[PDB]
């Protein structure tokens, strides 16, 4: 094991990789893309991302990864504390739940491409795939899913836009700017049905399924 040397190098450097690699390893990509897309509907930002949307995605991904963090805690933070498990079985035991989490959301042909271009030979089982292949495949799959969710969210607001424009132009309103009319209708649809809770719950459910 490591010796008061490298320990507190690998730790501080891991904290350095945290915000980018570790946050885009797990979640907060799908959620942030979906939130931004929802912000494209309903008009302008009207939600200060540096202040609110990013923090909401942060809280939502904390909630989402509560099970995997709990299992990591059980497998490592009990045994690794003071006895019988030292940073070698701890690493694989703590990798297992996150890796299962990522593999459970990755499209089954992303891994295909990233293996076929890493010149990896046969991969025996689902557990045999390494993080080297698992990371970009998970990122690409999560981008696909985020775009699907955003498209479904765009559906009803697109419907409202077209129906409002149709009503205005059919009733004779030759050349009114239907966008300003539609925006409060967008809000009404989004609040009367209690839209935010529906969105966060649907994301949370679909995220692991």
Partner 1 sequence: STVSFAGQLHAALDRISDRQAAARVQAEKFTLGEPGIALNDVMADMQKASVSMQMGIQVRNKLVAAYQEVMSMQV
Partner 2 sequence: DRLDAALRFQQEALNLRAQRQEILAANIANADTPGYQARDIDFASELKKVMVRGREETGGVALTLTSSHHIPAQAVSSPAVDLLYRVPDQPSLDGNTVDMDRERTQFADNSLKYQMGLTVLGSQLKGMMNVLQ
Partner 3 sequence: TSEQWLYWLHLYFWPLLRVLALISTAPILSERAIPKRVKLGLGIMITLVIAPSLPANDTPLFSIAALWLAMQQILIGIALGFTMQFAFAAVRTAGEFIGLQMGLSFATFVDPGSHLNMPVLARIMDMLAMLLFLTFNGHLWLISLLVDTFHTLPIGSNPVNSNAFMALARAGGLIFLNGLMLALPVITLLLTLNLALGLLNRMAPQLSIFVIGFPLTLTVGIMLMAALMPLIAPFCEHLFSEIFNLLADIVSEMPINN
Binding site for partner 2 (CB under 8 A): 3-5, 8-9, 12, 82
Least distance from partner 2 to the Cβ atom of residue 16, Å: 13
Contact call for residues 161 and 40 (beta carbons, < 8 A): no
Least distance from partner 1 to the Cβ atom of residue 67, Å: 10
Contact call for residues 85 and 93 (beta carbons, < 8 A): yes
Q: Is 113 in the site for partner 3 (CB under 8 A)?
A: yes
Contact call for residues 103 and 89 (beta carbons, < 8 A): no
Residues 9-48 that bind partner 3 (CB under 8 A): 11, 20-21, 24, 29, 32-33, 36-37, 40, 43-48
Binding positions for partner 1, rule: CB under 8 A: 1-3, 5-6, 8-13, 15-20, 23, 32, 35-36, 39, 45, 47-51, 53-55, 57-58, 66, 69-70, 73, 77
Q: Record the tokens describing residue 180, joined without a space.
A: 């300003």
In 3-state terms, what secondary structure has residue 91? helix
Q: Binding string, 135-154, against partner 3, x = CB under 8 A? A: xx--xx--xx-xxx-xx--x
In this complex, which beta carbon is closest to partner 3, that of residue 11 or of residue 100? 11
> Pick from partner 2, partner 1, its own copies, none: which does 82 bind, CB < 5 to 8 A by kind?
partner 2
Residue 175 burial class via C-beta count within 10 angstroms: exposed 0-12, middle 13-18, buried 19 and up: exposed
DSSP 8-state assignment for residue 77: I
User: In angstroms, rounded to a whole number, what is the distance separating the alpha carbons of residues 196 and 190?
Assistant: 8
Q: How many CB atoms lie within 10 A of CB 56?
A: 16
Contact call for residues 125 and 48 (beta carbons, < 8 A): no
| Closest by CA position to 29, among listed 106, 93, 126, 123 | 106
Least distance from its own copies to the Cβ atom of residue 100, Å: 18
In this complex, which beta carbon is closest to partner 1, that of residue 58 or of residue 176? 58
Least distance from its own copies to the Cβ atom of residue 85, Å: 26
Least distance from partner 3 to the Cβ atom of residue 104, Å: 19
């Amino acid at each position: 094991s490591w010796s008061l040397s490298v320990q507190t190098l690998v730790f501080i450097t891991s904290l350095t990789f945290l915000p980018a690699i570790l946050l885009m390893m797990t979640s907060f990509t799908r959620i942030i893309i979906v939130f931004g897309l929802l912000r494209n509907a309903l008009g302008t930002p009207s939600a200060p991302p540096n202040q609110v949307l990013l923090g909401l995605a942060l809280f939502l991904t904390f909630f989402i990864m509560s099970p995997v963090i709990d299992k990591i805690y059980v497998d490592a933070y009990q045994p690794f504390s003071e006895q019988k498990i030292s940073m070698q079985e701890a690493l694989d035991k703590g990798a297992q739940p996150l890796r299962a989490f990522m593999l459970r959301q990755t499209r089954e042909a992303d891994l295909a491409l990233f293996a076929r271009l890493a010149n990896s030979g046969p991969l025996q089982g689902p557990e045999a795939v390494p993080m080297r292949i698992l990371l970009p495949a998970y990122v690409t799959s999560e981008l696909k899913t985020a775009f699907q969710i955003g498209f479904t969210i765009f559906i009803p607001f697109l419907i409202i836009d077209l129906v409002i424009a149709s009503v205005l132009m059919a009733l004779g309103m030759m050349m009114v700017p239907p966008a300003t009319i539609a925006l409060p209708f967008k809000l009404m649809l989004f609040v009367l049905v209690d839209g935010w809770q529906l969105l966060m719950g649907s994301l949370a459910q679909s995220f692991y399924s």
